[PDB]
Amino acid sequence: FQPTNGVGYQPYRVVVLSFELLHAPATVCGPKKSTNLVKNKCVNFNFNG
Amino acid sequence: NCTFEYVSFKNLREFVFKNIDG
Numbered sequence: 679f680q681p682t683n684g685v686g687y688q689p690y691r692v693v694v695l696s697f698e699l700l701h702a703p704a705t706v707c708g709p710k711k712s713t714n715l716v717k718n719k720c721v722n723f724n725f726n727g
Numbered sequence: 728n729c730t731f732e733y734v735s736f737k738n739l740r741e742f743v744f745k746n747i748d749g
Contacts, residue, residue, distance in 0.1 A: 700730060701749070702730065702749050705731075
């Protein structure tokens, strides 16, 4: 690995993400954006499902 | 092949362990 090496021979950092889902509940999920809360008004609420 | 990992007389320590749908 040298500065003058060809692009094919230049170093490349490789990061592979693999996602495995077995017969078990899933822990790693995406973020769940939440809206602001309003009091003293008739609203349709959803708290933790 | 791991599928999980978590890290955090005088005493009566009672415990109840159970499994429901995994």
